[PDB]
Amino acid sequence: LVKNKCVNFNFNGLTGTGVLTESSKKFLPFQQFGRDIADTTDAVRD
Amino acid sequence: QCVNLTGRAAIQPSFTNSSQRGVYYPDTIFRSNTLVLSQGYFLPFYSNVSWYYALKRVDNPVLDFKDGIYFAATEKSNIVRGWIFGTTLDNTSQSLLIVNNATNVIIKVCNFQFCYDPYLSEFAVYSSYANCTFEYVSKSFMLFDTLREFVFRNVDGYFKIYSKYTPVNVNSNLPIGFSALEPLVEIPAGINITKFRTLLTIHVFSAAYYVGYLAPRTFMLNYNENGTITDAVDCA
Amino acid sequence: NSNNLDSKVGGNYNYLYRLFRKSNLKPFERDISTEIYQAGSTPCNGVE
Numbered sequence: 058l059v060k061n062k063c064v065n066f067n068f069n070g071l072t073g074t075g076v077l078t079e080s081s082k083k084f085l086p087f088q089q090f091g092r093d094i095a096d097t098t099d100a101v102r103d
Numbered sequence: 104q105c106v107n108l109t110g111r112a113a114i115q116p117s118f119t120n121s122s123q124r125g126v127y128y129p130d131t132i133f134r135s136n137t138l139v140l141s142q143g144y145f146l147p148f149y150s151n152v153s154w155y156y157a158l159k160r161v162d163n164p165v166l167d168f169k170d171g172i173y174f175a176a177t178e179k180s181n182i183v184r185g186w187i188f189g190t191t192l193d194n195t196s197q198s199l200l201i202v203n204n205a206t207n208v209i210i211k212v213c214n215f216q217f218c219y220d221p222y223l224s225e226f227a228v229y230s231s232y233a234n235c236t237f238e239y240v241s242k243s244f245m246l247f248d249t250l251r252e253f254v255f256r257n258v259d260g261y262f263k264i265y266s267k268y269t270p271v272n273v274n275s276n277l278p279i280g281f282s283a284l285e286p287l288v289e290i291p292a293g294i295n296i297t298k299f300r301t302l303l304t305i306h307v308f309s310a311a312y313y314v315g316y317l318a319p320r321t322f323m324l325n326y327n328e329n330g331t332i333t334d335a336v337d338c339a
Numbered sequence: 340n341s342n343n344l345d346s347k348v349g350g351n352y353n354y355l356y357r358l359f360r361k362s363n364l365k366p367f368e369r370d371i372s373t374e375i376y377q378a379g380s381t382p383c384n385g386v387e
């Protein structure tokens with residue numbers, strides 16, 4: 058996991074380009090992805 | 104073996120309403136600080152609900168599973184144990200049985216010859232069964248009063264169950280408030296369901312159960328910072 | 340294709356299908372009943 062750089066992440070079949078930082082969000086057991094106001098993914102369980 | 108409980112009072116339903124009860128999560132996505140508008144099948148706000156008592160009177164009548172059922176149970180002694188869903192409720196068609204014993208739940212999709220009056224005690228429900236397509240064993244759904252709420256929906260070959268459990272006060276009446284049920288199970292059954300009966304243990308210890316019907320409506324739902332539903336509006 | 344495994348010289352008659360039904364099936368729904376379909380009036384009562 059190359060961190061803090063512009064990369065292609067491909068997490069569990071979801072691909073894209075971005076930067077990864079730790080989060081304090083808590084997910085229910087049936088959730089893995091999270092979407093914000095613009096509906097794009099922001100939080101991913103690793 | 105089957106026996107007929109002679110000596111009960113005739114079943115008579117009372118009536119109340121489901122004020123802001125029965126709203127379930129429609130998606131498996133984490134949203135926070137957002138308000139969303141949704142379409143679907145929901146239990147209308149302030150809707151008429153039927154009331155049944157299990158106190159020498161046992162209420163186990165055949166009801167009509169139209170589009171989805173909201174089933175609430177107020178109980179301190181766990182009298183209510185399970186359900187049966189089907190159409191003919193004979194051995195000519197396939198039925199779904201959900202029964203909770205002390206430790207686990209048992210789900211079965213077979214051809215059952217249900218008795219004229221099903222009740223637990225032994226297991227005096229069906230004379231015999233055959234051609235079991237599906238079998239499941241999990242953990243008890245039902246592991247002073249305690250309110251247990253369920254939503255049973257039958258969509259696209261899948262039986263979907265959403266549940267919630269809260270300890271309430273001795274006022275057995277369906278509390279006025281807001282509830283947000285959470286997904287529980289999806290059973291691949293692939294059957295036709297138009298009727299259902301409730302399974303009641305008899306020793307009779309007090310219990311009460313309320314039934315409501317889902318209708319097609321639009322709802323406005325609210326999410327908080329932590330990602331849980333906290334308020335909703337019935338547009339119609 | 341499975342004409343090597345599912346065909347017998349005398350004939351294979353162990354595969355079945357439903358020919359008559361009162362109404363169309365819904366998605367991912369199954370029907371294994373074996374009642375007697377009633378083409379017209381005058382109910383059958385299993386006479387076939």
Ligand SMILES: *[C@@H]1O[C@H](CO)[C@@H](O[C@@H]2O[C@H](CO)[C@@H](O)[C@H](O)[C@H]2NC(C)=O)[C@H](O)[C@H]1NC(C)=O
Nearest residue numbers: 213214232233234235236353355370371372373
């Ligand atoms: C449902 O169950 C019955 C009984 O278990 C099945 O009928 C048996 O089928 C086998 C195999 O064809 C025969 O050898 C037996 O003689 C049958 N018994 C009787 C009493 O008819 C029936 O085939 C099953 N149906 C399905 C769809 O699986």
Ligand SMILES: *[C@@H]1O[C@H](CO)[C@@H](O[C@@H]2O[C@H](CO)[C@@H](O)[C@H](O)[C@H]2NC(C)=O)[C@H](O)[C@H]1NC(C)=O
Nearest residue numbers: 190191294295296297360361362363364365368
């Ligand atoms: C699910 O079961 C019901 C009841 O058996 C079926 O409704 C019947 O449909 C036929 C076909 O038009 C009618 O002649 C009957 O009068 C209906 N029964 C009742 C009680 O109204 C229904 O078709 C089944 N669903 C599917 C998808 O087959």
Ligand SMILES: *[C@@H]1O[C@H](CO)[C@@H](O)[C@H](O)[C@H]1NC(C)=O
Nearest residue numbers: 104105106107108218219220
């Ligand atoms: C219960 O009563 C019905 C008639 O109402 C009867 O057909 C059935 O056999 C009875 N059950 C018994 C005797 O176990």
Ligand SMILES: *[C@@H]1O[C@H](CO)[C@@H](O)[C@H](O)[C@H]1NC(C)=O
Nearest residue numbers: 119120121122149150276279
């Ligand atoms: C719903 O029932 C409560 C009592 O539990 C009552 O006060 C209220 O007016 C009822 N609402 C409607 C719309 O009938």
Ligand SMILES: *[C@@H]1O[C@H](CO)[C@@H](O)[C@H](O)[C@H]1NC(C)=O
Nearest residue numbers: 118119120149150151152153
């Ligand atoms: C609920 O329906 C029953 C039967 O139709 C009726 O008697 C009762 O008044 C209804 N309840 C309300 C609050 O309208």
Ligand SMILES: *[C@@H]1O[C@H](CO)[C@@H](O)[C@H](O)[C@H]1NC(C)=O
Nearest residue numbers: 193194195216230231232233
């Ligand atoms: C199915 O039900 C009929 C009554 O409708 C009964 O006579 C028959 O024995 C039952 N079959 C089995 C296998 O229990």
Ligand SMILES: *[C@@H]1O[C@H](CO)[C@@H](O)[C@H](O)[C@H]1NC(C)=O
Nearest residue numbers: 204205206207208209240241
């Ligand atoms: C209850 O159901 C479970 C199924 O997991 C079974 O193993 C057990 O013997 C049953 N009875 C009791 C008393 O737990």
Ligand SMILES: *[C@@H]1O[C@H](CO)[C@@H](O)[C@H](O)[C@H]1NC(C)=O
Nearest residue numbers: 083326327328329330331333
């Ligand atoms: C979210 O949960 C925390 C505890 O983990 C709690 O302190 C906070 O009040 C909750 N958020 C809201 C809006 O209640």
